[PDB]
Symmetry: D2
Subunit: 115 residues, 4 copies
């Protein structure tokens, strides 16, 4: 699993379940083309987004639909979504874990990169 | 000052100075059109981006060029930049403060609306 | 104003008002002796805790009563309080700003030293 | 595993390895008595701190020796350590995951509580 996304809820102290995640790859014409998508599981994790063969070097954007998540909980969020943009595999294949901690008016995101 | 941006450095424990910030407004055709831009001051703050008259309801994107900031410090950052996308509600007198705490592989952002 | 505290609310997107803050200094016998205290203002800030003369080198602990803050809002918090323990170096002119972003089950704290 | 601690490094984008962790329980005399201790593994995690039987209701303090961690990396940290104080099991046994994201002058901590 070269790309994994984990989302936590800072208000309820639990994984953020059923959060929609869309991944895009910057195309040759500087356009964002759909790469993969899914929803976080009961553990707040999303696996199987891509394969080592498909996950080539490039600039990727991980969009986390935080707005819909908070709306479903009856909380008016500030952000439309949380975006994480990064260059991947520019120096060989790596394993990426993109994590996000969500709050209605704030979010923190970090990345753990492994060989 | 309807919109203000503040950036901090979590590695050095100081304001993030000279950080480029670009603000965009979503156009009728779902395109991001330039709205305002500038660089954070010595206090890591950026004021005077817009006026109450110009800052109408809509979806705005604040792009913080974090990559260039870390590069200038000799640190390889993870993110290309930090983006904050939000809807300006306008309902009632409101000042928006977008703050971001930067680390090489992480960043936290919060909004203070008063 | 050598030491300043700022607290924000990540749930409501506003300053954390009326938050009790207690500052302690580690005594010669490794005990925490009261140093200063107060409550955050409408801007979520707390100034005038000490003076340059009184704020000598040493280990300080800033305790933020986060529990009471969330209780007053009807939210069951996880932490008893938020503690920030640091050493005041003094080496060179320095102002310390301790900031904390609060959520019911999480909090982030950073220090800005200028 | 009723109590687990996970520590990440926001500067290197990796788990924080070999971080000393001390857990204390507030005694009847308002004193902090040693409860358990250990060091994070290669995954930045610390398991086996206690058992369901030993982890009774009470106020616990998880002290993460962040200072030593940054010192070993040649970085002058701001905090002496990171402390997480919370009441546990006050309404029945729960599983607690205490996570911390570390930076030289900042740290974020969150808790994930499960049944
Ligand atoms: O640090 C400050 O002085 C500050 C002042 C105004 C607004 C935000 C600020 N800091 C900040 C910014 C983003 C995420 C967390 C914090 C924290 F944790 F610091 F609150």
């Amino acid at each position: 699993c070269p790309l994994m996304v984990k989302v936590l809820d800072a208000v309820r102290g639990s994984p953020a379940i059923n959060v929609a995640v869309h991944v895009f790859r910057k195309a040759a014409d500087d356009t964002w083309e759909p790469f993969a998508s899914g929803k976080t599981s009961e553990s707040g994790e999303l696996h199987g987004l891509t394969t080592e063969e498909q996950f080539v070097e490039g600039i990727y954007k991980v969009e986390i639909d935080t707005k819909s998540y908070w709306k479903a909980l009856g909380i008016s969020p500030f952000h439309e979504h949380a975006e994480v943009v990064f260059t991947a595999n520019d120096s060989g294949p790596r394993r990426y874990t993109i994590a996000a901690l969500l709050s209605p008016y704030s979010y923190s995101t970090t990345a753990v990169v492994t060989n």
